């Protein structure tokens, strides 16, 4: 073992088939009596907003972390003059089902308040970008399963048809043990005929936003609470619920659908209070890890079309502590596409293809000054991108064998680049993930439009996410955002106790 | 770090791109010399039952856990009178296959014995429930691979044709890197015509039993046995092996296929016997974990069709130990569907969707009642259920273009629950999962038949599993269940050292 | 206690739902300042060979391990007389793509000298068999996604279309969240008509060989080089880079395609150097792991068609030391398939099916003699083979319903049996996977041809990874095999601390 | 009907009932036909109890 260059300690291991002797230990798994599910109905729900107020039955019963809300709906579509003619029923087999995920993609903001202190997300904007990280296949089949979940891979629905991974298709055509397309999801059709269609059935969505979870892995649930309350509020159009594919759109211009009407009925909310065993006691005061996500958008001009390039820069945005990570991407601008039921229904949620990023921390100019666009797709994947290199930089050259119509090109969805802040960006001496505060950040990346058909006005985004502890001791909830001392983030002993692979799990 | 509401300890770990220093030892992996595999041919195989006896090469051998049996078969179908025609070829491309898993669904029971003490899980029924449960896609493409294993997901084959996820499809049409359909299994067809078919082949099955694992993890193999012996008994019906879609049959319940005859030849099992290094000694008395499964059933003789709901009580059952975990699924009941070749060959293995399951403990009444079928699906995907929410509570719409024939619904698959008691049942203090004191349960559950065409008569199953240690020593095998004493569950010190996500991989 | 003498220890773990006390420690993640990536364009790249010279900035700046090289390319074709004609575009919708992975398959060898001492791995023949091995579904969509990736299942491209997993096909037809067929990759198509076609893109390639990677699973990167240099040499033929399917070509028959010219444009590597922070200091000399990939090959004069079997009887190859792993397969021979192009493009890379393997490793002289050909597959899969058993030993029955054309069999690739040395082959006591000695092995295996059309002329392969540590201390790089000694290997005390799946990860 | 108690300090009285407005259309099959009496008959027609 020694005798080669440096000497090294020697150790031996056992091929797994035979331990055989090692100390065997019998382990009993304790769990407090009375795990029960209590469904609260909504107090004071409205078309554009819902409200709940749920009290854990008693102080000292731990409430688990996964929660969700089921909301029954309805819809009616109507044929409009004068799309040149309509033959056949408005809804088609492979043409249309919900956007993914339907309820939250309409939500403006979701605020929840716990033990008297409020904690909010901004759901409408974050989710599609947040959704690609970092669901392994196993976990897209996990809890994700409840709402429709197939992310829109295609840059314009029209071209999707008629394909095997067409994002909105019938349950058949899914290949065995995979993600089923959005059109698989079930609901009644009261009636469906030319000139009119009515449809109805109850659909679930998970509450997102920390400390509530939506992933593989469980964790210790909040207790001891005295209050809770979950206020939604949904942005005003409500046409973004449904999807469409423009193949069926009339040749000159117009659509079959305009216009549509959406309901909701009282929606319940499902949570689970687990009281614990008398003998084992639970601390008087206790601390949970809580993240806190923010968005910053900046629209740019002029629009680029049909597939040309340009550059964009952002004004300096100053933050209060290094965020855990920072997402970036360039979406088709919202100010456009909120015209018309038609546009809102037809258009997909995919980004524009980043051909190079250059960003700058205060006092460092040109981080990743000349990093391969492709090399950006290298990390993450490292933080969990989970979609082939072809999705990233999406354009697929597909050719046809006949004389002599030229071969058509498909836009395939741009990328969303995420750099973990301490690890990938690089960071000065005596600074760390939750230290405070006040550094400036400015990012100038360049984008190519890929989408063939439409002239796309663009827009940039940034997302931050902050590491933060939150102590909740009944009755109150002080949550601090700078939890590490500058002089104690320098000179902390290192440790090979925990592998950095382990931290990859605890996420939000 | 401190300066929080509570002071917390600090440690620093580095990003993985540079460790870079630590004490990195070299490591020799030393497992015993002389591995080998024998092919024991079965003395006294008949048409009803197979039976082998296998003794280890000698003392000082550790038999490895993975065991499997291979068995050359032969089948002749014959066209029946007088559905004719009958035009075209008996057997079609994506209409016929084996049923998955074949030689396991036919066999009644599989008793083996170690050192004189007989362990034995009866196979029929149980396999179909367990198969779905613990396997993910990485495991499925491992050993599980040998037998046909694309488990049925269409309420009836009739509609199944011909989507890219048809359970009995040809190997072409299964996406790359997914579960392939049952018609991909090599069998060589000496002839296929109208009025005649004959197929020769050999097929592998994985002995399923408590001691053996059938999943990829490998753990110490049974040392140190002197004798071993297997025993399979096949049900006399034996036509259950083949599966065959409805579509071709007609005009009215006339199926082409009736009736075939199946023979077998000379089945042989394979065991792998390692012998450990002479230097390193193995203890004279070892203790393995040993799980014991046993299914209780009550069939009620009522019918419901095609989509009505109702409810039934499973009926009292007394027990001495609380099981580790318990499954509960209402399936289509076999007293019907065994008469006629017709029913026997074409009816798929799926179960009925559940609306609400409500269990009652001993004197509890009780319990877990108020949990939406939606919430019932949360646990488990937590112990690994591996299907979407779509397949569970399975019934899905399909849209229909052209005017004005109505859109048609498609039944998908049944939902099969499972709740490890301590984790999901809730339990009175002093009662770990696997002690011994007297208590009894009954389970009542509402259910709906979702399949579209046949009157289906239900029944129930409750499959419990008990934990205990089986101590193998030379020469004998004591088995103990309820190894903990009731006083001992109180006053057992909690260890943070072990974690719960580990115990999911120790199953089971 | 107790109750299972020998009585065992009892520890009680908590439910995952509730802890709720244990040491919550805030973990400051820290990695040194200023990561940066720089693209190294080659000077003296030529169409036949190309080579880059790229040192790190200084000593004491850790160099990352994943490196990759992108190469812009230009290809034109010409219509081949006298199959003509010949209607339709040369290229076809799903009859043509890149062979995967392209750059490596065409390149004869590749040498990357570290800190002055050269390390090289013939790349042309090794990669195809090593590829199938260590890649899960997660990783296939991870880094490796960058080049065309989808591997060959069918034995003759001719048959496969139109199949949902036919390896060359447009993006549509590929189901969601899976390995996509090689057609979907990008290439600007400038002109395509009968009698010509011109195409150009920029295609990526990971550099392969140790210490670089690969499966990430990122690890401690190389520090501290002073110089680093890469050369590739590319086989003269160069036509091997394209694919094609036999279906298009004429009956006799001539191929529609011959001939074609390929070029390159500046092609450039990409590698990023972190630099460490002032607080934490990195050692003067550090030791990495490192493996080498030998290849030994022997070919036989006897041919066998269309689907008959025989045996060999491999030439004795003598091995320098016990090697970590061995892969041994029988492929179609390289002597043929380098003449006349048509076959050279048409032929796929799949192996032949193994019926019995029996090899004389260490005076045992019978090894795996009587182990069922199925059994090898399973034991190998314990090493990650990631392909369903059906495809290993590939031959598949597919029948039809038209009276009365005979059913046809498809050839489906063979397997590549691999056997880790301590775990599978067994070793005389006193032998470990590192230890230097002098022994030689001679394989002896039967093989059956499966593909229906061509007369295969077979040949053997045997690949092995040696194990040893390499120590980089500027400016030096002594590498050593056989680091542990024989007196040392025996007597080495075994740990229970580290386990075995850990030793599964550090593969390279 | 998902309804919430007003204060949770107010006892809820035990008798509860619902009311459903409803609408039926009858029509005659041919044959039996015909038929010459009103499709609803003075003494031969009612709701089943309790409907």
By CB neighbour count within 10 A (0-12 exposed, 13-18 middle, 19+ buried), where does B296 fall? middle
Nearest to A332 by CA among A152, A208, A480: A152
Q: Cβ contact (<8 Å) for B24 and C276?
A: no
Q: Cis omega (within 30 of 0) on the bond before C368?
A: no
CA distance B58 to B275: 9
Q: Which of C27, B131, B51, B282 is nearest to A495 (CA)?
A: C27
Give SS3 for B282. Answer: coil
The rounded distance, in Å, linking the Cα atoms of A352 and C79 is 39
Closest CA to A146 of C66, C98, B391: B391
Tell me the shortest Cα–Cα distance from B237 to chain C, in angstroms. Answer: 27
Stated length of chain C: 508
Kindly report the nearest CA distance between residue B142 and chain C, in angstroms.
Answer: 6
User: What b/e readout covers A155-177, taking b as 16+ CB neighbours within 10 angstroms?
Assistant: bbbbbbbebbbbbbbbbbbbbbb
Neighbours of D42 (CB within 10 A): 7
**Cβ <8 Å between B287 and C164:** no
Place of tokens 């008398």: A278
Closest C-chain CA to B181? C390
Q: Is B132 helix (H, G, I), strand (E, B) or coil?
A: helix
For C254, the token pair is 């001539």
Task: Please state, in angstroms and rounded to a whole number, the distance separating the CA atoms of residues A328 and A463.
Answer: 7
Inside any domain, residue C382: yes
Identify the experimental approach.
cryo-EM
Burial class (CB in 10 A: 0-12, 13-18, 19+), B492: middle
Q: How far apart are the first and last CA of chain B?
A: 42
Residue with tokens 């669904």: B105
- Measured distance CA(B303)–CA(B459) in Å, rounded: 10
List the structure tokens of C456: 């295969």
Question: DSSP assignment, residue B489?
Answer: H
Please provide residue A451's backbone torsions phi and psi, each rounded to the nearest 5 degrees.
-40, 120
Nearest chain B residue to C22 by CA: give it.
B496
* Residues of D in Cβ contact (< 8 Å) with A41: 2, 4
Number of domains in chain A: 1
The pairing of strands C317-321 and C107-114 is unpaired
C506/A contact by beta carbon, under 8 A? no
Grouping H, G, I as helix, E, B as strand and the rest as coil, residue C318 is strand
Residue C25 lies in a domain: no
Instruction: State the nearest Cα–Cα gap between C66 and chain B, in angstroms.
Output: 10
Q: Could you write out the three-class secondary structure of A280-304?
A: CCCCCCEEEECCEEEEEEECCCCCE
* Angle (CA) B366 B368 B373, round 5°: 140
Using CB atoms within 10 Å of the CB of residue B132, give its burial: 0 to 12 exposed, 13 to 18 middle, 19+ buried. buried
Which H or E element spans position B326?
strand B325-328
Render C335-372 in DSSP notation, one character per residue.
STTSSSSHHHHH---PPPEEEEEEE-SSS---SSTT--
Contact C22, B497 (CB under 8 A): no
D50: which residues sit within 8 A by CB, 6+ positions away?
none
Tokens 């049923």 locate to: B99
A3/C494 CB distance under 8 A:
no
- Could you tell me if B220 and B66 are in contact, meaning their C-beta atoms sit under 8 angstroms apart? no
What are the C-alpha distances in Å from C140 to residues A375, A384, B138, C74, C151? Answer: 17, 13, 13, 27, 11
Q: How far apart are the first and last CA of chain D?
A: 20
Which chain A residue has its CA at the smallest distance from B471's CA?
Answer: A24
CB pairs under 8 A between A and D: 5
Strands B62-63 and B268-274: antiparallel
Whether B391 contacts B153, CB under 8 Å: yes
Q: What residue of D is the nearest CA neighbor of A41?
A: D2
The answer to whether residues B167 and B99 touch, using CB atoms and an 8 Å cutoff, is no
Among the partner residues A11, A31, A498, nearest to B422 by beta-carbon distance: A31
Cross-chain Cβ contact D4/A268 below 8 Å: no
Could you give phi then psi for residue B423, rounded to 5 degrees?
-65, -45
What does the buried/exposed string (b/e) look like for A105-126 if buried means 16 or more CB atoms within 10 Å of the residue's CB?
A: bbbebbebbbbeeebebbbbbb
Q: Is B498 on the interface with C (CB under 8 A)?
A: yes
Distance CA A94, CA A173 (A): 10
Q: Tell me the backbone φ, ψ of residue A298, rounded to 5 degrees.
A: -150, 115
Q: Name the nearest CA neighbour of C252 among C342, C333, C337, C341.
A: C342
Structure tokens at B208: 């399923």
Q: Is residue A87 part of a domain?
A: yes
Tokens representing C282? 């990195």
Grouping H, G, I as helix, E, B as strand and the rest as coil, residue A37 is strand
Q: Which of B399, B409, B450, B471 is the best residue to mutate to test the A interface, defined by the most A CB atoms within 10 Å of its own CB?
A: B399
- The DSSP bridge pattern shows strands A10-13 and B26-29 to be parallel
The full length of chain B comes to 508
* Residue A413 in domain: yes
Torsion over CA: B464, B465, B467, B469 (sign): positive
Residue B442: in which H helix or E strand, if any?
A: strand B439-448
Instruction: Tell whether A142 is within 8 A of chain B (Cβ).
Output: yes
CA–CA separation, C195 and A404 (whole Å): 13
CA distance A401 to chain C (A): 5
User: B402: nearest CA in chain A?
Assistant: A88
Look at residue B187 and tell me if it is in a domain.
Answer: yes
As a whole number of angstroms, the distance between CA B417 and CA B379 comes to: 8
Q: Please answer whether residues B129 and B463 qualify as being in contact, where contact means their C-beta atoms are separated by less than 8 angstroms.
A: yes
Residues in chain D, total: 51
Name chain C contacts of A176, Cβ cutoff 8 Å. Answer: none
Determine contact, residues A303/A457, Cβ cutoff 8 Å: yes
Cα(A121)–Cα(B206) distance, rounded to whole angstroms?
50
Of B3, B14, B276, the CB nearest to A494: B14
| Cβ-based contacts of B17 with chain C (< 8 Å) | 31, 35, 62, 64, 218, 220-221, 274
Give CA separation, C148 vs C180, C235, C349, C417, in Å.
9, 20, 15, 24
d(CA C352, CA C330): 6
- Rounded (10°) CA dihedral C182, A375, C125, A396: 10
Angstrom distance (rounded) from CA A318 to CA A309: 28
- Whether residue C155 contacts residue C413, with contact meaning beta carbons closer than 8 Å, is answered with yes
List gaps in chain D by the residue before each (C–N > 2.5 Å): none
Breaks in chain C, named by the residue before each, with C–N above 2.5 Å? none
> How close C24 comes to chain B (CA, Å)?
7
Give A142's contacts in chain B (Cβ within 8 Å).
381
For chain A, breaks with the C atom over 2.5 A from the next N come after none
Q: Is C433 left (phi over 0), alpha (psi -120 to 50) or beta?
A: alpha
Q: How close is the nearest chain A Cα to the Cα of D8, in Å? A: 13
Coil, helix or strand for C258? coil
CA C39 to each of CA C36, C149, C264, C273: distance values in angstroms, whole numbers, following the listed order = 10, 24, 17, 12
Cβ separation of B10 and A492 shorter than 8 Å? yes
Tokens describing residue A435: 């230290």
Q: Which two tokens stand for residue C313?
A: 């009887």
A and C adjacent (3 or more CB pairs under 8 angstroms): yes
Coil, helix or strand at residue C152: coil
Full domain range(s) for residue A368: 31-508
Cβ separation A268–D2 shorter than 8 A:
yes
B278 φ, ψ to 5°?
-60, -40
Residue B20's SS3 state is coil
Resolution of the determined structure in angstroms stands at 3.5
Q: Which residues contact A506 (CB under 8 A, 6 or more apart)?
A: A289
Searching chain A, which residue's CA lies closest to the CA of residue C164?
A164
Compute the nearest-CA separation of C219 from chain A (Å).
Answer: 10
CB A407 within 8 A of CB A398: yes
C276 touches B: beta carbon within 8 Å: yes
Which chains neighbour D (Cβ–Cβ under 8 Å, 3 or more pairs)? A
Tell whether A268 lies on the interface with D, counting CB pairs under 8 A.
yes
Cis previous bond, A132, omega within 30: no
CA–CA distance, B220 with A24 (Å, rounded to integer): 11
| C410 is a domain residue | yes
What Rg do the C-alpha atoms of chain C give, in angstroms?
26
By C-alpha distance, which of C127, C53, C449, C62 is closest to C275? C62
Q: How far apart are CA B236 and CA B331, in angstroms?
A: 22
Question: Which positions 477-496 of A are in contact with B (Cβ < 8 Å)?
Answer: 478, 480, 482-485, 488-489, 492-496
Instruction: Nearest chain A residue to C472 by CA: give it.
Output: A5
User: Is residue C396 in a domain?
Assistant: yes
Residue contacts between B and C (CB atoms, under 8 Å): 283
Minimal CA separation from B184 to chain C, in Å:
6
Q: Does A429 touch chain B (CB under 8 A)?
A: no
Q: In 3-state terms, what secondary structure has residue C386?
A: coil
**A266 contacts on D by Cβ (under 8 Å):** 2
From start to end of A137-268, where are the E strands? 188-193, 196-200, 203-206, 228-234, 261-264
Nearest to C12 by CA among B422, A219, A22, D43: B422
Answer whether B166's CB lies under 8 Å from B159's CB.
no
CB-closest option in C4, C15, C276 to B480: C4
Tokens of A255: 């659509």
Residue C10 lies in a domain: no
A260 interfacial to chain C (CB closer than 8 Å) = no
Q: Report the SS3 class of residue C421.
A: helix
DSSP B332: B
Q: Is B379 in CB contact (< 8 Å) with chain C?
A: no
CB A99 within 8 A of CB A258: no
Burial class of C446 by CB neighbour count within 10 A (0 to 12, 13 to 18, 19+): middle
Task: Report the residue from C36, C173, C272 with minimal CB separation from A163.
Answer: C173
CA distance C312 to B443: 63
Using CB atoms, pick whichever of B18, B145, B480 lies closest to residue C389: B145
Cβ atoms of residues B122 and B129 within 8 Å: no
Residue reference for tokens 């080495």:
C492
CA distances from B113 to B54, B58, B214, B469, C220 (A): 11, 18, 18, 16, 50
Best residue of B132, B323, B375 to probe chain A, by most A CBs closer than 10 Å: B375
Q: What per-residue string of b and e applies to B344-366 under the rule 16 or more CB within 10 Å gives b?
A: bbbbbbbbbbbbbbbbbbbeeee
CA distance A99 to chain D (A): 28
Question: Around Cβ C263, how many Cβ atoms within 10 Å?
Answer: 12
| CA neighbor of B434 nearest in space, from B321, B292, B319 | B321
- A partners (3+ CB pairs within 8 A) are B, C, D
The 10 Å Cβ neighbour count of residue A299 is: 12
Q: In whole angstroms, give the CA distance from residue A439 to residue A362.
A: 6
CB < 8 Å to C398, chain B: 93, 170-172, 183
Q: Do A43 and D4 touch (CB under 8 A)?
A: yes
Q: Looking at CA atoms only, how far is residue D6 from chain A in angstroms?
A: 11
Q: Does A219 touch chain C (CB under 8 A)?
A: yes
**Mutant choice from A72, A266, A268 vs D, greatest count of D C-beta within 10 A:** A266
């Amino acid at each position: 073992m020694s005798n080669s260059a440096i000497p090294l300690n020697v150790v031996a291991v056992q091929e797994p088939r035979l331990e055989l002797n090692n100390e065997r230990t019998w382990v009993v798994v304790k769990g407090g009596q009375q795990v029960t599910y209590y469904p609260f109905p909504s107090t004071s729900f409205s078309s554009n907003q819902f409200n709940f107020i749920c009290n854990p039955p008693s102080a000292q019963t731990v409430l688990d972390r996964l929660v969700f809300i089921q909301v029954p709906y309805d819809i009616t579509f109507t044929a409009n003059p004068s799309h040149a003619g309509i033959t056949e029923n408005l809804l088609q087999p492979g043409r249309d089902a919900f956007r993914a995920f339907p309820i939250s993609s309409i939500t403006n903001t979701l605020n929840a308040t716990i033990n008297g202190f409020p904690v909010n997300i901004e759901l409408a904007q974050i989710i599609h970008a947040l959704s690609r990280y970092h669901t392994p296949l196993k976990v897209k089949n996990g809890w994700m399963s409840m709402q429709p979940s197939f992310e829109d891979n295609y840059q314009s629905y029209r071209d999707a048809d008629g394909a095997n991974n067409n994002p909105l298709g019938v349950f058949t055509s899914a290949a065995g043990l995979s993600e089923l397309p959005r059109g698989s999801y079930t609901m009644n059709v009261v009636t469906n005929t030319t000139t009119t269609a009515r449809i109805t059935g109850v659909l679930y969505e998970q509450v997102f936003l920390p400390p509530f979870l939506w992933d593989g892995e469980q964790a210790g649930g909040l207790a001891n609470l005295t209050s809770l309350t979950f206020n939604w509020v949904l942005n005003n159009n409500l046409a973004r619920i449904w999807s469409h594919s423009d193949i069926t759109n009339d040749v000159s211009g117009n659509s079959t659908i305009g216009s549509m009407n959406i309901s909701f009925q009282q929606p319940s909310m499902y949570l689970g209070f687990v009281t614990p065993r008398l003998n084992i006691p639970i601390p008087p005061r206790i601390t949970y890890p809580y993240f806190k996500l923010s968005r910053y958008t900046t629209q740019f001009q002029n629009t680029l079309a049909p597939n040309a390039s340009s550059t964009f820069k952002s004004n300096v945005v100053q933050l209060d502590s290094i965020p855990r990570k920072l997402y970036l991407f360039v979406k088709q601008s919202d100010n456009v596409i909120y015209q018309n039921l038609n546009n809102q229904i037809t258009t997909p949620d995919v980004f524009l293809q980043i051909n190079n990023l250059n960003l700058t921390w205060n006092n460092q100019q040109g981080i990743l000054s000349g990093a391969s666009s492709q090399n950006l797709y290298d990390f993450s994947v490292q933080n969990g991108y989970n979609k082939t290199w072809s999705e990233f930089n999406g354009v697929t050259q597909q050719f046809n064998g006949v004389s002599g119509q030229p071969t058509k090109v498909i836009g395939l969805e741009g990328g969303i680049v995420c750099l973990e802040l301490g690890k990938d960006v690089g960071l000065r001496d005596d600074e760390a993930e939750g230290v405070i505060g006040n550094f400036n950040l400015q990012v100038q990346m360049t984008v190519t439009n890929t989408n063939q058909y439409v002239t796309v006005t663009p827009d940039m985004y940034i997302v931050a996410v902050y590491d933060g502890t939150l102590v909740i001791s009944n009755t109150s909830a002080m949550a601090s955002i700078g939890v590490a001392s500058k002089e104690e983030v320098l000179n902390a002993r290192i440790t090979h106790g925990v592998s950095y692979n382990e931290l990859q799990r605890i996420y939000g």
